[PDB]
């Protein structure tokens, strides 16, 4: 087939993730994202069940694609001499959480709860599929502005989920845990929960709590916005300095602040004016 299956549109962005274009599958007018990744700029490689050399990102995306659409799913991929082209789902209208927070500032707790809850369901789905994202942050979360549904993107810093220690890391440092800063060692789940604490603080305060290594290691969270005591508690639990003092996903989702969550469509009607 080749590249007659997709009509290329405007470039949506570029960076550490490659170059991502807006596209449309010619067969059924479905919106898609066309991500180009240069072979020379890739570091983590893997293999597909059928014995073929591909970027780890494709390995991981394939393992999480299907039914529960909490992750932007991989529809197809191609190999060129110097790059890999990935065809992904695309939402329209859409906005990432970083830009959303830039425009609107600190989110009301009701909205932050619906969003965080959806992120939690999406990360559980990844772990269930044997995948560790390793770069959970607002830039890697997209919002369906009509449906109020969030979707996790960019598995370029991810890894297969394991129960042993990780000694490599190439995600975002200000979202990285103290055990990584001090010892260059972490376990997947507890490191994920720490990033989720940074993300929740970021949603309810309008910015991340720590910028410097010294601040991450000290682990003291100061609040700049009015935030309920139950919400502050959940953030500080997720940001416990000892990994084993952090909650599991189940404990996060059963926490008092996480009760009575709005469904995505309700969330959009109240807060996205849709």
UniProtKB/Swiss-Prot annotation:
Gene Ontology terms describing biological process: apoptotic process; cellular detoxification; cellular response to type II interferon; negative regulation of apoptotic process; negative regulation of DNA-binding transcription factor activity; negative regulation of innate immune response; positive regulation of brown fat cell differentiation; positive regulation of cardiac muscle cell proliferation
Disulfide feature: none
Protein's UniProt keywords contain Kinase: yes
Induction profile: By interferon-gamma (IFNG). Strongly induced in leukocytes by the JAK/STAT pathway in response to cytokines. Induced by different cellular stresses, heat shock and cytotoxic agents.
Residue list for modification Phosphoserine: 66, 229
Pfam families: Pkinase
Function: Proto-oncogene with serine/threonine kinase activity involved in cell survival and cell proliferation and thus providing a selective advantage in tumorigenesis. Exerts its oncogenic activity through: the regulation of MYC transcriptional activity, the regulation of cell cycle progression and by phosphorylation and inhibition of proapoptotic proteins (BAD, MAP3K5, FOXO3). Phosphorylation of MYC leads to an increase of MYC protein stability and thereby an increase of transcriptional activity.
Protein name: Serine/threonine-protein kinase pim-1
Lineage: Eukaryota, Metazoa, Chordata, Craniata, Vertebrata
């Amino acid at each position: 087939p080749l590249e007659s299956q997709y009509q290329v549109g405007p470039l949506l962005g570029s960076g550490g993730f490659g170059s991502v274009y807006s596209g449309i599958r010619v067969s059924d007018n479905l919106p898609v994202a066309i991500k180009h990744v240069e072979k020379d700029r890739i570091s983590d490689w893997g293999e597909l069940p059928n014995g073929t050399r591909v970027p780890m990102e494709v390995v991981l995306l394939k393992k999480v694609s299907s039914g529960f659409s909490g992750v932007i799913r991989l529809l197809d991929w191609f190999e060129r001499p110097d790059s890999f082209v990935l065809i992904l789902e695309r939402m329209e209208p859409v906005q990432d959480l970083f830009d959303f927070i830039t425009e609107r500032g600190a989110l009301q707790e009701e909205l932050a709860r619906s969003f965080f809850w959806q992120v939690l369901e999406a990360v559980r789905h990844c772990h269930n599929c044997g995948v560790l994202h390793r770069d959970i942050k607002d830039e890697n979360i997209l919002i369906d502005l009509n449906r109020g549904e969030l979707k996790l993107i960019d598995f370029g810093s991810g890894a297969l989920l394991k129960d042993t220690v990780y000694t490599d890391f190439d995600g975002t440092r200000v979202y990285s845990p103290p055990e990584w800063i001090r010892y260059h060692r972490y376990h997947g789940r507890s490191a994920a929960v720490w990033s989720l604490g940074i993300l929740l603080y970021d949603m309810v305060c309008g910015d991340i709590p720590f910028e410097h290594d010294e601040e991450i290691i000290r682990g003291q969270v100061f609040f700049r916005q009015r935030v309920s005591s139950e919400c502050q508690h959940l953030i500080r639990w997720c940001l416990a300095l000892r990994p084993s003092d952090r909650p599991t996903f189940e404990e996060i989702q059963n926490h008092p602040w996480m009760q009575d969550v709005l469904l995505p469509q309700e969330t959009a009607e109240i807060h996205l004016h849709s």
